[PDB]
């Protein structure tokens, strides 16, 4: 027989992590691996249809994606849907698939609104999720002995689909659910200048542990303003939620990184200010299989799509897709091994959930909620040469923290500052 | 020829103002009026197709309505879409019709998000909206001299689809756009004694002119608490934005309308407290044509849908539907009078916009934004009788305030309190 896979991704724009120019080679590699493996679907072939989820302007929209999904369903009637990545575009498509009882597979849309299975049923997310960041934050708070208060700030920028809104809300909800502590939040505009002054005036009266979701340039400007005002690392700590590693180029294997220098004439001041800043990023795979997959992915993409890919954590987004696809195939086989049909949906989704799989990224696990557990990394600056390096890794499958080569998380004073000063905020 | 009209409204649930059981008689009356008039599409017949915009639970959903609209468009390819009324259900249908270049008519959906004509082109709103409430509030502030600060509070419930939230965002946005003053806002739980206590503690230090969106029981409880909380009528004023007038009847003109009487032993305290409260509702038409239309609508509904309607301002929602339909028909005729077809959405939409029409509701005016200007009424308590009565009316076409029978606002100290006290916050 034939198996149809429907993809709803931007086929023209090549600026998104889930763009077709970076996913198509991964899908081709997954199909080749499935064909070369007699274990997965013996005697069956897999097809693929594509649809555009962007308007004339070239950006993902919540109007074109549902129409494309409906047209694909009417014309081909596929068994599984791939994508989209944008939350506003994927959510109506997810609801449509749930109503149609058609399984949905994705690695994007990490918004908390997809965490409820009553509405978004038969939906699997094989990519990173914002709840795992909240779990990492809770684990770090438990390890560092902070249980009183926290402060949250996020920046608003016109042009994107509120990148620092869903992440902040999901992490905030997860912290409230798990830690049961008082947490505040605030939104600021990075374009304005008086907003920074108001932020530096209001931070000392709201807390001492601050999480910031903004651009690396905005973070550097805020850190410089804090240094000039009088803020020091002995009482304040700053965390930057750079999941894709923009401040540090790529976030690849070990190499000296100096995000405080850009040749603006104030490199010394930025270097001194960044003594109290840490970055939270994703964890790159270490097995050579990941390197080989990256090499083949880059080669095939260059030869077949006229696109030149770079080195970074963004490449971890399409790869998960690949792995997820493989998992789906296995589940189908299990259904075909238990006297079933490929048009059930519920059985395949139930079999996929709460399962351990091995892929190019490594050993992944899917819980009962259909959300892949992701590892995280914390970057710290070397006090000697002033370069950031990886010092702590968090495993979500076992929820544990591990150091790297015995590295010690140094502090300006000697131990982490207390969550609330003895004199209080007054 | 045949003109197909698609309706996407709840067919089983009758608890919504835009339910089919209350719109169907109006639609058939409009069709009969069109057929009985020789200047409205002569020689043409109008057919109506229906679809459901509710899930198995029988409530408004944002998934069933777009699917029903898509199926109706595929099966019949209608020339115009009617409804839905729920904001969440009608939100994707507007974009779908804009992409399909099919005109859409809606007497509901008063959400501010529909005011962007770029995203929601070819959409006409012939019913009440929330921006006109902001215009009325700005006019009242200009008349009363309040130009410093205001406070807004709304209640949260898990049953409704955030009605107070949408009303408050629309009112706050229009006040900010027009009066460019400082306005605050808060959200409180519908049933929480601790929340009520902390709200009554927070209110005195934020402002003096306060607008509240909540249920009548919640408003009564809040006013009763404020009675012994120390708040008096010489410094504080309260406004209840009950558009449909649930605390009152609204349907009939002459009637007592005692809102503070409930037979719970606190009638005297409620009457004493309510001396510093005012209510803003919709304006009830008074022409005999409206009464005749209401009588016919009740008779037809009882005969056909086996539903018994109740007097009130809610009956003003389906009636506008009727009027709106008539307007659309006229536009079509104009197209057929200027060398066009029935599938010219842009020309028809331009023709309906910025036009004056006569209907059972009176003289309706559509501005260039495609939104019908609405009227509002402000009530006041009788100093002697103690029963609420209509004292102010607002005309949105001319944007004017009109008194009723030479009545005056009842103030405990004679003049409205200032926005900011002399001592300060």
């Amino acid at each position: 027989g034939n198996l149809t896979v429907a993809v709803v991704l931007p086929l023209a724009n090549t600026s998104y992590p889930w763009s077709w120019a970076r996913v198509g080679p991964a899908v081709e590699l997954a199909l080749a691996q499935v064909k070369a493996r007699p274990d997965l679907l013996p005697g069956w072939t897999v097809r693929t249809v594509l649809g555009s989820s962007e308007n004339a302007l070239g950006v993902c929209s919540d109007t074109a994606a549902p129409l494309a999904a409906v047209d694909l369903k009417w014309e081909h009637n596929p068994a599984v849907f791939l994508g989209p990545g944008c939350v506003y575009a994927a959510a109506p498509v997810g609801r449509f698939t749930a109503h149609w009882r058609v399984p949905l597979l994705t690695a994007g849309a990490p918004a908390l609104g997809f965490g409820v299975k009553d509405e978004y049923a038969l939906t699997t997310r094989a990519g990173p999720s914002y709840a795992k960041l909240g779990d990492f934050v809770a684990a770090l708070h438990r390890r560092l002995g902070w249980e009183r208060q926290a402060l949250m700030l996020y920046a608003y920028r016109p042009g994107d689909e509120e990148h620092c809104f869903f992440l902040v809300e999901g992490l905030f909800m997860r912290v409230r659910d798990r830690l049961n502590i008082t947490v505040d939040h605030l939104e600021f505009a990075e374009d304005d200048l008086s907003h920074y002054t108001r932020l530096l005036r209001t931070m000392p009266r709201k807390g001492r542990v601050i999480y910031i979701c903004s651009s690396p340039d905005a973070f550097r400007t805020l850190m410089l303003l804090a240094l000039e005002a009088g803020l020091c690392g002995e009482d304040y700590v700053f965390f930057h939620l750079d999941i894709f590693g923009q401040s540090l180029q790529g976030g690849q294997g070990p190499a000296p990184r100096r995000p405080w220098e850009r040749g603006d004439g104030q490199d010394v001041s930025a270097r001194q200010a960044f003594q109290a800043a840490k970055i939270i990023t994703y964890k790159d795979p270490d097995n050579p299989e990941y390197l080989e997959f990256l090499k083949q992915l880059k080669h095939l993409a260059y030869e077949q799509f006229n696109f030149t890919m770079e080195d970074g954590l963004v490449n971890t987004i399409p790869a998960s897709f690949h792995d997820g696809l493989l998992l789906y195939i296995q589940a189908v086989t299990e259904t075909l091994a238990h006297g079933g049909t490929v048009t059930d949906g519920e059985n395949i989704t139930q079999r996929m959930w709460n399962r351990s799989f091995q892929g190019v990224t490594g050993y992944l696990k899917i819980d009962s909620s259909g959300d892949r557990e992701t590892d995280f990394s914390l970057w710290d600056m070397d006090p000697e040469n002033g370069a950031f390096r990886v010092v702590l890794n968090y495993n979500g499958t076992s929820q544990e923290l591990v150091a790297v080569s015995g590295r010690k998380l140094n502090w300006p004073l000697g131990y982490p500052p207390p969550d609330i000063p003895k004199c209080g905020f007054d | 020829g045949n003109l197909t009209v698609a309706v996407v409204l709840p067919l089983a649930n009758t608890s919504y103002p835009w339910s089919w059981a209350r719109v169907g008689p109006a639609v058939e009356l409009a069709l009969a009026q069109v057929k009985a008039r020789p200047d409205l599409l002569p020689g043409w017949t109008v057919r109506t197709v229906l679809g459901s915009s509710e899930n198995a639970l029988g409530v408004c959903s944002d998934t069933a309505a777009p699917l029903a609209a898509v199926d109706l468009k595929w099966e019949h390819n209608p020339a115009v879409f009617l409804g839905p009324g729920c904001v969440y259900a009608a939100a994707p249908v507007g974009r779908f019709t804009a992409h399909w270049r099919v005109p859409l008519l809606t007497a509901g959906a008063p959400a501010l998000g529909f005011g962007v004509k770029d995203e929601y082109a070819l959409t006409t709103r012939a019913g009440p909206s929330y921006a006109k409430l902001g215009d009325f509030v700005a006019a009242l502030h200009r008349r009363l001299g309040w130009e410093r600060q205001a406070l807004m509070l709304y209640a949260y419930r898990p049953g409704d689809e955030e009605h107070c939230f949408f009303l408050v965002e629309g009112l706050f946005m229009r006040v900010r756009d027009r009066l460019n003053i400082t306005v605050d806002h808060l959200e409180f739980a519908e049933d929480d004694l601790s929340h009520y206590t902390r709200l009554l503690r927070t209110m005195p230090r934020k402002g003096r002119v306060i607008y509240i969106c909540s249920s009548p029981d919640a408003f009564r409880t809040l006013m009763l608490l404020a009675l012994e909380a120390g708040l008096c009528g010489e410094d504080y004023v309260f406004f209840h934005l009950d558009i449909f007038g649930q605390s009152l009847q609204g349907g009939q003109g002459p009637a007592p309308r005692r809102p503070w009487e409930r037979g719970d032993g606190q009638d005297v305290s409620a009457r004493q407290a309510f001396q510093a409260a005012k209510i803003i509702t919709y304006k009830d038409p008074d022409n005999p044509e409206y009464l005749e239309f209401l009588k016919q609508l009740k008779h037809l509904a009882y005969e056909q849908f086996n539903f018994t309607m109740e007097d009130g301002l809610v009956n003003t929602i389906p009636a506008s539907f009727h009027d709106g339909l008539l307007l659309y028909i006229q536009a079509v005729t104009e197209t057929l009078a200027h060398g066009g077809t029935v599938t010219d959405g842009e020309n028809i939409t331009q023709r309906m916009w910025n036009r004056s029409f006569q209907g059972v509701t009176g003289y309706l005016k559509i501005d260039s934004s495609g939104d019908r200007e609405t009227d509002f009424s402000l009530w006041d308590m009788d100093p002697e009788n103690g029963a609420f009565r209509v004292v102010l009316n607002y005309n949105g076409t001319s944007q004017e305030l009109v008194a009723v029978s030479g009545r005056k606002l009842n103030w405990p100290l004679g003049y409205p309190p200032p926005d900011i006290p002399k001592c300060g916050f």
């Binding site: 939350v87 918004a111 939040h185 | 998000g113 949260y156 965002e169 409180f188």
Partner: peptide, 21 residues
């Protein structure tokens, strides 16, 4: 405005980050 359950057509911008839970 982190109360959640607002994923139902979140394209509306609006304001009012004062849920006051």
């Amino acid at each position: 405005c982190f109360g959640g359950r607002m994923d139902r057509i979140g394209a509306q911008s609006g304001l009012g980050c004062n849920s006051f839970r």
